[PDB]
Amino acid sequence: EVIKEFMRFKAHMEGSVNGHEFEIEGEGEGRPYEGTQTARLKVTKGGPLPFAWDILSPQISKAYVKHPADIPDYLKLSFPEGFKWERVMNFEDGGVVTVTQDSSLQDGEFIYKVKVRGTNFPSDGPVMQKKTMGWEASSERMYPEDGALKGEMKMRLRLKDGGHYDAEVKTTYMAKKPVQLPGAYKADYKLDITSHNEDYTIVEQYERCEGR
């Protein structure tokens, strides 16, 4: 049908973190029913970034989440029109990241438009000093509320110096048509940076996500 067993995507991201503006463009591919995907991203403006790429990686794809048959796959069902999402991440040291995203399907490939704002990150923190080392696996609590599918999760970022750096995350995912919302369930994620040049202006990532 509209969602094939293999799908490519194009992504464009604009934003600002602690006042630093940037643009990122990327292309990816994956297997939406198996919950797996990879992408190649390039910082096209504002590179090299003065902050950890790790805060941007989750803002680059929910059409690729493996679901059981008895769970309506609301975000897949939303296509060809698609869906929008709005996210707020509250980090333990007061940093905040907010995101608004549009997902659409244009002639057989997914199109992602992302806007990112980060603010209040301590200048001496792991984000502005780039001391981060990738996200631990996460479980997102999914639940229907107010005509939308909501997600909530605590995410933990590994630090290069030893510890962990935590965020509280809340996201609203909204189909462009009112397709069948699921009941409550959990989506488990693993997101890895698989390749990156010295300054991270070219980065590759891989993610597996499965609803339980």
Author numbering: 6 to 65, 69 to 220
Paper text:
To create a further red-shifted monomeric RFP, we investigated whether the AYC motif could red shift the emission wavelength of the far-red emitting RFP mPlum. mPlum is a member of the mFruit family of monomeric RFPs derived from DsRed and differs from mCherry by 13 mutations (excluding N- and C-terminal tags). Its fluorescence emission wavelength (λem) of 649 nm is the longest of the mFruits and is red-shifted 38 nm compared to that of mCherry (λem = 611 nm). Ile65 and Glu16 appear to be major contributors to mPlum’s long emission wavelength as replacement of either residue results in an up to 40 nm hypsochromic shift. These residues interact through an H-bond between the side chain of Glu16 and the acylimine carbonyl oxygen atom of Ile65, and this interaction gives rise to a dynamic Stokes shift that is responsible for the far-red emission wavelength of 649 nm. Chromophore maturation in mPlum results in a mixture of protein molecules containing either the red chromophore (λ = 588 nm) or the green chromophore (peaks at 391 nm and 506 nm).
The two mutants that displayed the highest red fluorescence intensity, mPlumAYC-E16A and mPlumAYC-E16P, were further characterized. Their absorption spectra displayed three peaks centered at ∼390 nm (neutral green chromophore), ∼510 nm (anionic green chromophore), and ∼590 nm (red chromophore), similar to what is observed for mPlum. However, unlike mPlum, the highest intensity peaks for both of these mutants in the pH 7.0–9.5 range are the ∼390 nm and ∼510 nm peaks, suggesting that the majority of RFP molecules contain a green chromophore instead of a red chromophore. mPlumAYC-E16A and mPlumAYC-E16P also mature to molecules containing red chromophores that emit at 639 nm and 637 nm, respectively. Interestingly, these mutants emit at wavelengths 10–12 nm shorter than mPlum (λem = 649 nm). This is presumably because they have lost the dynamic Stokes shift resulting from the H-bonding interaction between the chromophore acylimine and Glu16. Since our mPlumAYC-E16A and mPlumAYC-E16P mutants emit at 637–639 nm, we propose that their 11–24 nm longer emission wavelengths result from the red-shifting effect of the π-stacking interaction incorporated through the AYC motif. The crystal structures of mPlumAYC and mPlumAYC-E16A did not contain appreciable omit map density (contoured at 3σ) corresponding to the presence of an oxidized peptide backbone with sp2-hybridized C-alpha carbon at residue 66, which is indicative of red chromophore formation. However, these structures did show well-resolved tetrahedral sp3-hybridized C-alpha atoms at position 66, indicating green chromophores.
